[PDB]
C-alpha cells in the first residue's frame, strides 16, 4: 500500500513497514492503539499516528531528522508497559516476541568460578568494523574482556585479587532478533559526530555462535524478514529506506513508494567500500525471525 | 590500515613481489563498485620458449591478456599482447583450454553478466563465436564457466538461475527458445536433453537446486563435478553417470566458492557464515571447520606443492582462503583432525566437528579478495580494485645457473 | 611508590599450612616433602612413616601465595615463586632464604626445571619468562649481587604454567591465550606454536627427549603433542571442569590427571577408554606429585585448595566414566591449619571478631596483635550484635584474609586517624589523655629498633615474633622482619634506607 511521508517522516514509516512484515507482530496486534488503528487501515496518512507521537514524546516534538533505533525501541516498550498496566484487572506479548536474555558473565582466571547477571533486550546493538559481516559484529560484541595487572577482581572464594574475564552471551533467544548496527558513532571531537558506511554484510538466514551452552534451543535458524535502510552521509541528514519479504517476492518501500525487487539486489545496501562516505546506503536495523 | 607483504610458515618466509603485480596500464585502482568480480586464468602453451605462461585477467568492461613470468619482472604493462573492451554487458569469468593451446592457438572463452559465452583467441584475433548471444538459452548473469576435463569442443556454464548448461564449440546455437526432454529426475536437482532433430547448442540443461549456483568445480580426475548454490548445499555428482553423489548443507547462509584437493579425497567450502567447511569424498561426512574469517569466503583453493599424501610420513594437506574480509587464510589438514581415533545430521553441530584455526591470516589487500591460485614458484591474489599479487615462495624468489 | 606497613597476626611457628597448597617437591634422598602453601609459607615434611609428627621445619620469606616450587642440585637448592612478584633462592637442607630476585612485574605463577644443565625458568601474569643458571644463582653474595638476566619474548597474555625438558633443550609455556608456545633455552628461538586448547593452560609436561608434550587445559582436555609434527597427536577427555595438575610416569606411557571436579584419574595414553578413577577429592587438586622411588609408581602426593595434604597408595592399579575408585582412604594424611575466610572489624576500630574453616569465632585485638579469646562454634552474626560497642571511632587500617592468616596493612592515608581515650580503652594516676591509635602502633611495631629510643610506648606491647613487612601499593614487597629482629647490626641499617619518612616521624621524632 504505502505510507505518506509528510517531511522527515521517513524513519517512522520505515520502521513502521518493517515493524509490520513480522508476521508474529502483524497478527497479535488486531487486539499505542493508534498504531492498532493505522494496521486494520492498510489491511494513507498516519497523521493519527504521528501527532499522537509527537504530544507523547517531547524528544520527537522537533520536525528534524532523528534515529529509527531510538524510536523502534522506544515504541515497543511503550507498548509493552500499556499491556502489563492494562493487565492488572507477567510476560506480555510484546516481550514473547521480541524479548531476549543475555547474561554479563565474570569469571575468575584462578578458581573458575561463574557469576551472572542477567539482562532482557527488545535490539541488539552491535558495533560495526570495515568489511566485516553481521556474524563477526556479534563475536566481536561478545568479546572477552580481561581484569589483569593493576585492575584485578577480587574473588571471594580465592580471598585475593585474581585475574578476570567478563564476557557477554546471549541466554535466551528471542522470537524476532532486531540487530541494530551502530553506524552513528561519536566523532571524537567537538564536531558531530560521523556517519560510518562500512561494508557490513549480512546473509539471509542466520545462526548465533556467541550462544551459552547452558540453553537448550541455542543454535535455532533465522531467517530475514526486514531491514531498515539508511541513506544520507549524516547522522541527521538523511532518509530512511525499508526492504522486505512479504512472500517469496521482495518489496522495496521508499516512503509512499513501493516496488518489487529480486533478492540479489541486496547487495547494494550492505555498506561502502572505497569509503567515499557518499550516500551509504546501508542496513541500519536487521529482523530476523525463527525457524520454528 | 595497511596491507601486510609477507607471513612466515613452518616453510619459510613468504613474499610479497610488487615488481611483479599484473594491473592495468595506467595502475588507478579500479572503483570498488558493486559491478562483477575481478577473475584470473592461467594457461601454458607447452613452455616452448620458457616464457609459456599467458595470463587473463578481466576488469570491469576491460579484459588484458598479458605474458605471465612469475616471479620475475612482470612484462610491459603498457603493451598487452590482447585487449579487449566491452562497452555492452561486462565479462564475469572465463577459462582457457589448456588441452588445445599451443604457440599458434589458444582456445579462451568468456562468461557475461548477461548470460553470454564467447570463444576467443587472444594470440591470433581471428575468431570470435558467441553463444546464447540472442539470451533465448537463459537470460540471468553467468557466475562460473571452465571447459570439461579432456574434452576440446564441451564446455560447461553456471548461470544465476540455478542452472548449467553444456555447451559445444561446432554447435551453434537456435533462433529461438529451446525444448527441453527430461533425462534423470534427482533429489532437488533434475537433468534435461534439447528435443532437436538439428545438433542445437545446448547438449543439456542441469538444474541444480534452489538458488544461484555460485561456482562449480570438477574432480582433478574428471569424473565427478562439485557444485555450491546459493540456498548453502554442496551437491557433488558423478559427471559421467550424472546422478547425486553427495549433499551437505551450510551451517547457515549458502556456499559461495567449492574446490577439490590434489588426490581428490576432500573438498572444502566457503560460505556466507565466514566458515571453511572441510568434506571427506568417500565417507560423504564433514570432518572440519574453519573459523579465521571476518566476513564472507569468496576463494578456497588447495596448495598441492606443500601437501603430502601417503608415505611412513604423515598425511597433511594445505589450503588457504581468501574472503570478503580482505584477508588471507592458511589452513592445515592434519590426521589429528581427518583420522580422528536445517538437518543437523548432514550438517553436524558445531560440538560434533573439529574447529580448525588458520596458520595465517593477513590483511593483503585494500579491497575484497576474489583470487586464489597455487603455483609451483609462488601463490597468486587478486582485488576488486584488479591487483593481481604474487607472492613469492620460499626459496622460490631468486635462481642460481 | 606509596610505602605501606604490615603486619601478621600470628603464632610464632604455624607449622601447619594455614591455607591451601599449591605446588610440591620431594626429595627421596632424604624423604622429605616440601609443600607451596597459599599461606605464603613453604613446609618441610617427612613421608618417612616411621616417624608420626612429619614437620621438621618451615621457610617462610613470602609475603603473598607461594604458586609453584622447584627442588635443584640434589636437594640442596629450593626455588621459589609467588604472588608478591619475587623468586627466592632457598638453602633446602638448613631451611633459610639465600637470595631475592625481583625482576617480574606481576605474579609469578609458574617455575620450569632442567636437571641436566641445573636451569630453572619462572613466569607468570607480566606476560614474562626468564631463564636462570641455579649454580650461579646460589653463589650470590653481598658484593656480587648481580647476576645475567635471559628472557624470552613471545607471549601476548598471561602466563598459567611452564615446563622444560630435562635435557635443557625445550621449553613450553601455557596460557590464557590458548596457544602453546614453545623456545630453546639456549638460544632463545621461537620454535613453534601449539594451537587447539580452547581455554587456560595450567598443567604442562615434556619427555626427557623434548619431543612430546602433555598439556592440561581448563577447556577440559589433556593434549599430547608432537613437536616433531609440531601439532596434536591425541585429545583426552576424561574431566568434567577445568584440568589444572598433570603427572607422568618414567615411560610417558600413563598420565595421572586432576582439577576442578576433585577427580583423578590414570589415563593410558596409546589406549584412552582404560581410565582407572584413584579417588575423588574433598577440594580442587590443584597440583600432584608422584613418588618415584619405583619402576611403577608406589603412590602420589595429591594438593588442593584445603589445608591438608594426603598421599594415595596405587597397589591394586594394574589389576582394575569409572564410577568406582581405586581408593577412599589416603594413605599419608598430613594435617592443616584452619583459614580465617570471615572477618569484621567492630564500632571501636581495635577488636575484630573472626571465623575460620571450622566455622569456629574468635575475637581478636589489632592494637595488641593477640587473639583474646576463641568462642567455637558459636552463630557469627549474632556475635556480632553481641559484641556491639556504642562509640564512633574512623576506619585506621585495612584487613586482608589471602594468606588465611590476619595480615593487617597501615596505610599514611589515614592511619593517625585514631585518637582514642586511654581510659575506656583499657589503660590507666589515670590522667586519661587523647591516644592515637596508629601513631601508638607504629611505635611498638618498632619497639626493638634502637633508633626509637623510652623502650616502647608503655602500655603496650606487641608479640616478638609478629612480622612487619614494608612494601609498596599493589606492589613489591621493600623489606620483611620480625619485630624482635630489628635491632640487628645489618637489619638496623636497612631500616635507615626502606622505612618512609612518616613512619620516621612518628617514631623517632615523636611528632603525632
Ligand atoms: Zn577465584
Not at chain 1, 558513532?185 to 538466514?205: A, C, G, I, N
Not at chain 3, 569465632?361 to 587473639?371: H, P, Q, S, T
Given at each position: 500500500f504505502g505510507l505518506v511521508n509528510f517531511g522527515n517522516t521517513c524513519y517512522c514509516n520505515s520502521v513502521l513497514q518493517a515493524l509490520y512484515f513480522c508476521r508474529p507482530f502483524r497478527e497479535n496486534v488486531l487486539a499505542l492503539t493508534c498504531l492498532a488503528d493505522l494496521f486494520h487501515s492498510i489491511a494513507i496518512p498516519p497523521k493519527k499516528f504521528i501527532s499522537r507521537l509527537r504530544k507523547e514524546n517531547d524528544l520527537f516534538d522537533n520536525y528534524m531528522q532523528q534515529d529509527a533505533h531510538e524510536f523502534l525501541n522506544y515504541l515497543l516498550n511503550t507498548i509493552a508497559d500499556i499491556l502489563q498496566e492494562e493487565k492488572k484487572q507477567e510476560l506480555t506479548w510484546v516481550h514473547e516476541i521480541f524479548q531476549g536474555t543475555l547474561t554479563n558473565e565474570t569469571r575468575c582466571l584462578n578458581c573458575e568460578t561463574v557469576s551472572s547477571k542477567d539482562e532482557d533486550f527488545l535490539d541488539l546493538s552491535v558495533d560495526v568494523e570495515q568489511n566485516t559481516?553481521?556474524?563477526?559484529?556479534?563475536?566481536?560484541?561478545?568479546?572477552?574482556?580481561?581484569?589483569?595487572?593493576?585492575?584485578?577482581?577480587?574473588?571471594?572464594?580465592?580471598?585475593?585479587?585474581?585475574?578476570?574475564?567478563?564476557?557477554?552471551?546471549?541466554?535466551?533467544?528471542?522470537?524476532?532478533?532486531?540487530?541494530?548496527?551502530?553506524?552513528?558513532?561519536?566523532?571524537?571531537?567537538?564536531?558531530?559526530?560521523?556517519?560510518?558506511?562500512?561494508?557490513?554484510?549480512?546473509?539471509?538466514?542466520?545462526?548465533?555462535?556467541?550462544?551459552?551452552?547452558?540453553?537448550?534451543?541455542?543454535?535455532?535458524?533465522?531467517?530475514?524478514?526486514?531491514?531498515?535502510?539508511?541513506?544520507?552521509?549524516?547522522?541527521?541528514?538523511?532518509?530512511?529506506?525499508?526492504?522486505?519479504?512479504?512472500?517469496?517476492?521482495?518489496?522495496?518501500?521508499?516512503?509512499?513508494?513501493?516496488?518489487?525487487?529480486?533478492?540479489?539486489?541486496?547487495?547494494?545496501?550492505?555498506?561502502?567500500?572505497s569509503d567515499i562516505s557518499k550516500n551509504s546506503e546501508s542496513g541500519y536495523i536487521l529482523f530476523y525471525q525463527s525457524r520454528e | 590500515n595497511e596491507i601486510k607483504t609477507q607471513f612466515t610458515t613452518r616453510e619459510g618466509l613468504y613474499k610479497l613481489l610488487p615488481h611483479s603485480e599484473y594491473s592495468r596500464p595506467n595502475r588507478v585502482p579500479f572503483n570498488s563498485q558493486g559491478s562483477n568480480p575481478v577473475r584470473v586464468s592461467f594457461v601454458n602453451l607447452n613452455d616452448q620458449s620458457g616464457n609459456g605462461d599467458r595470463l587473463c585477467f578481466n576488469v570491469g568492461r576491460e579484459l588484458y591478456f598479458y605474458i605471465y613470468k612469475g616471479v620475475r619482472k612482470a612484462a610491459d604493462l603498457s603493451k598487452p599482447i590482447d585487449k579487449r573492451i566491452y562497452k555492452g554487458t561486462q565479462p564475469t569469468c572465463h577459462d582457457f583450454n589448456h588441452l588445445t593451446a599451443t604457440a599458434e592457438s589458444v582456445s579462451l572463452l568468456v562468461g557475461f553478466s548477461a548470460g553470454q559465452v564467447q570463444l576467443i583467441d587472444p594470440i591470433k584475433k581471428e575468431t570470435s563465436k558467441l553463444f546464447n548471444e540472442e539470451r533465448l538459452i537463459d537470460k540471468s548473469r553467468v557466475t562460473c564457466v571452465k571447459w570439461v576435463p579432456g574434452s576440446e569442443s564441451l564446455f560447461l556454464v553456471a548461470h544465476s538461475s540455478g542452472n548449467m548448461y553444456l555447451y559445444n564449440v561446432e554447435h551453434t546455437c537456435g533462433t529461438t527458445a529451446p525444448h527441453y526432454q527430461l533425462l534423470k529426475q534427482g533429489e532437488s536437482f533434475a537433468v534435461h536433453t534439447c528435443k532437436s532433430k538439428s545438433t542445437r547448442n545446448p547438449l543439456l540443461k542441469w538444474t541444480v537446486g534452489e538458488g544461484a549456483l555460485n561456482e562449480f568445480a570438477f574432480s582433478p580426475d574428471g569424473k565427478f563435478l562439485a557444485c555450491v548454490s546459493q540456498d548453502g548445499f554442496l551437491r557433488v555428482f558423478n559427471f559421467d553417470s550424472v546422478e547425486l553423489h553427495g549433499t551437505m548443507k551450510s551451517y547457515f547462509g549458502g556456499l559461495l566458492c567449492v574446490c577439490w584437493s590434489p588426490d581428490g579425497k576432500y573438498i572444502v567450502t566457503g560460505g556466507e557464515d565466514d566458515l571453511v567447511t572441510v568434506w571427506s569424498f568417500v565417507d560423504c561426512r564433514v570432518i572440519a571447520r574453519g573459523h579465521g574469517h571476518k566476513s564472507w569466503v569468496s576463494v578456497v583453493a588447495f596448495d598441492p606443492y606443500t601437501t603430502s599424501g601417503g608415505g611412513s610420513v604423515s598425511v597433511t594437506y594445505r589450503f588457504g582462503s581468501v574472503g570478503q574480509d580482505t584477508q588471507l587464510c592458511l589452513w592445515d589438514l592434519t590426521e589429528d583432525i581427518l583420522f580422528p581415533h536445517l538437518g543437523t545430521p548432514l550438517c553436524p553441530r558445531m560440538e560434533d566437528v573439529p574447529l580448525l584455526e588458520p596458520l595465517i591470516c593477513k590483511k593483503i589487500a585494500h579491497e575484497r579478495l576474489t583470487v586464489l591460485i597455487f603455483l609451483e614458484d609462488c601463490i597468486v591474489t587478486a582485488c576488486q580494485e584488479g591487483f593481481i599479487c604474487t607472492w613469492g615462495r620460499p626459496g622460490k624468489v631468486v635462481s642460481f645457473n | 611508590r606509596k610505602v605501606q606497613v604490615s603486619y601478621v597476626i600470628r603464632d610464632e611457628v604455624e607449622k601447619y599450612n594455614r591455607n591451601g597448597v599449591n605446588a610440591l617437591q620431594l626429595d627421596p634422598a632424604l624423604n622429605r616433602l616440601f609443600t607451596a602453601g597459599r599461606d605464603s609459607i613453604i613446609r618441610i615434611w617427612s613421608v618417612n612413616q616411621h616417624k608420626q609428627d612429619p614437620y621438621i621445619a618451615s621457610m617462610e620469606h613470602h609475603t603473598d601465595w607461594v604458586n609453584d616450587i622447584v627442588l635443584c642440585?640434589?636437594?640442596?637448592?629450593?626455588?621459589?615463586?609467588?604472588?608478591?612478584?619475587?623468586?627466592?633462592?632457598?638453602?633446602?637442607?638448613?631451611?633459610?632464604?639465600?637470595?631475592?630476585?625481583?625482576?617480574?612485574?606481576?605474579?609469578?605463577?609458574?617455575?620450569?626445571?632442567?636437571?641436566?644443565?641445573?636451569?630453572?625458568?619462572?613466569?607468570?601474569?607480566?606476560?614474562?619468562?626468564?631463564?636462570?643458571?641455579?649454580?650461579?644463582?646460589?653463589?650470590?653474595?653481598?658484593?656480587?649481587?648481580?647476576?645475567?638476566?635471559?628472557?624470552?619474548?613471545?607471549?601476548?597474555?598471561?602466563?598459567?604454567?611452564?615446563?622444560?625438558?630435562?635435557?635443557?633443550?625445550?621449553?613450553?609455556?601455557?596460557?590464557?591465550?590458548?596457544?602453546?608456545?614453545?623456545?630453546?633455552?639456549?638460544?632463545?628461538?621461537?620454535?613453534?606454536?601449539?594451537?587447539?586448547?580452547?581455554?587456560?593452560?595450567?598443567?604442562?609436561?615434556?619427555?626427557?627427549?623434548?619431543?612430546?608434550?602433555?598439556?592440561?587445559?581448563?577447556?577440559?582436555?589433556?593434549?599430547?603433542?608432537?613437536?616433531?609434527?609440531?601439532?596434536?597427536?591425541?585429545?583426552?577427555?576424561?574431566?568434567?571442569e577445568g584440568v589444572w595438575a598433570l603427572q607422568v610416569n618414567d615411560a610417558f606411557t600413563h598420565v595421572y590427571s586432576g582439577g576442578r571436579d576433585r577427580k583423578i584419574y590414570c589415563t593410558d595414553l596409546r589406549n584412552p577408554d582404560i581410565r582407572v578413577l584413584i579417588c575423588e577429592e574433598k577440594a580442587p587438586v590443584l597440583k600432584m606429585e608422584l613418588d618415584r622411588s619405583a619402576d611403577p609408581p608406589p603412590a602420589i602426593w595429591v594438593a588442593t585448595t584445603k589445608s591438608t595434604v594426603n598421599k594415595?597408595?596405587?597397589?591394586?592399579?594394574?589389576?582394575?566414566?569409572?564410577?568406582?575408585?581405586?581408593?577412599?582412604?589416603?594413605?599419608?594424611?598430613?594435617?592443616?591449619?584452619?583459614?580465617?575466610?570471615?572477618?569484621?572489624?567492630?564500632?571501636?576500630?581495635?577488636?575484630?571478631?573472626?571465623?575460620?574453616?571450622?566455622?569456629?569465632?574468635?575475637?581478636?585485638?589489632?592494637?595488641?596483635?593477640?587473639?583474646?579469646?576463641?568462642?567455637?562454634?558459636?552463630?557469627?552474626?549474632?556475635?556480632?550484635?553481641?559484641?556491639?560497642k556504642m562509640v564512633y571511632v574512623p576506619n585506621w587500617f585495612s584487613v586482608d584474609l589471602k594468606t588465611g592468616m590476619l595480615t593487617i596493612t597501615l596505610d599514611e592515608s589515614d592511619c593517625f586517624a585514631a585518637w582514642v581515650s586511654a581510659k575506656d580503652a583499657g589503660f590507666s594516676d589515670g590522667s586519661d589523655p587523647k591516644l592515637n591509635l596508629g601513631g601508638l602502633l607504629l611505635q611498638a611495631l618498632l619497639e626493638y629498633w634502637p633508633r626509637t629510643h623510652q623502650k616502647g610506648n608503655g602500655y603496650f606491647q606487641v608479640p616478638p615474633h609478629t612480622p612487619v613487612i614494608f612494601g609498596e601499593a599493589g606492589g613489591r614487597t621493600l623489606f620483611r622482619l620480625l619485630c624482635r629482629d630489628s635491632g640487628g647490626e645489618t637489619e638496623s641499617m636497612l631500616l635507615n634506607e626502606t622505612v618512609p619518612q612518616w613512619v620516621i616521624d612518628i617514631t623517632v621524632d615523636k611528632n603525632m
Open positions: 559481516s553481521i556474524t563477526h559484529c556479534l563475536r566481536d560484541f561478545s568479546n572477552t574482556e580481561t581484569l589483569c595487572s593493576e585492575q584485578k577482581y577480587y574473588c571471594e572464594t580465592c580471598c585475593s585479587k585474581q585475574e578476570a574475564q567478563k564476557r557477554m552471551r546471549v541466554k535466551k533467544l528471542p522470537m524476532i532478533l532486531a540487530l541494530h548496527l551502530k553506524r552513528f558513532k561519536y566523532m571524537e571531537q567537538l564536531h558531530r559526530y560521523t556517519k560510518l558506511s562500512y561494508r557490513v554484510v549480512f546473509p539471509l538466514e542466520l545462526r548465533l555462535f556467541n550462544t551459552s551452552s547452558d540453553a537448550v534451543n541455542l543454535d535455532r535458524m533465522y531467517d530475514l524478514v526486514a531491514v531498515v535502510v539508511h541513506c544520507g552521509s549524516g547522522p541527521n541528514r538523511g532518509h530512511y529506506i525499508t526492504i522486505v519479504k512479504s512472500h517469496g517476492f521482495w518489496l522495496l518501500f521508499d516512503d509512499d513508494i513501493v516496488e518489487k525487487i529480486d533478492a540479489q539486489a541486496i547487495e547494494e545496501f550492505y555498506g561502502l567500500t | - | 642440585c640434589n636437594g640442596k637448592t629450593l626455588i621459589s615463586a609467588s604472588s608478591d612478584t619475587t623468586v627466592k633462592v632457598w638453602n633446602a637442607h638448613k631451611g633459610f632464604c639465600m637470595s631475592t630476585l625481583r625482576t617480574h612485574k606481576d605474579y609469578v605463577k609458574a617455575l620450569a626445571y632442567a636437571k641436566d644443565k641445573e636451569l630453572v625458568a619462572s613466569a607468570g601474569l607480566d606476560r614474562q619468562i626468564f631463564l636462570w643458571d641455579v649454580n650461579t644463582l646460589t653463589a650470590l653474595t653481598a658484593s656480587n649481587n648481580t647476576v645475567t638476566t635471559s628472557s624470552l619474548s613471545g607471549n601476548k597474555d598471561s602466563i598459567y604454567s611452564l615446563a622444560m625438558n630435562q635435557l635443557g633443550t625445550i621449553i613450553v609455556s601455557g596460557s590464557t591465550e590458548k596457544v602453546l608456545r614453545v623456545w630453546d633455552p639456549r638460544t632463545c628461538a621461537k620454535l613453534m606454536k601449539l594451537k587447539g586448547h580452547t581455554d587456560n593452560v595450567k598443567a604442562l609436561l615434556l619427555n626427557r627427549d623434548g619431543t612430546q608434550c602433555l598439556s592440561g587445559s581448563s577447556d577440559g582436555t589433556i593434549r599430547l603433542w608432537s613437536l616433531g609434527q609440531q601439532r596434536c597427536i591425541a585429545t583426552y577427555r576424561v574431566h568434567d594415595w597408595t596405587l597397589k591394586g592399579i594394574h589389576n582394575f566414566n569409572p564410577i568406582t575408585p581405586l581408593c577412599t582412604q589416603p594413605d599419608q594424611v598430613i594435617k592443616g591449619g584452619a583459614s580465617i575466610i570471615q572477618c569484621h572489624i567492630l564500632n571501636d576500630k581495635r577488636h575484630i571478631l573472626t571465623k575460620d574453616t571450622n566455622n569456629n569465632v574468635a575475637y581478636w585485638d589489632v592494637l595488641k596483635a593477640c587473639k583474646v579469646e576463641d568462642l567455637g562454634k558459636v552463630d557469627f552474626e549474632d556475635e556480632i550484635k553481641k559484641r556491639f
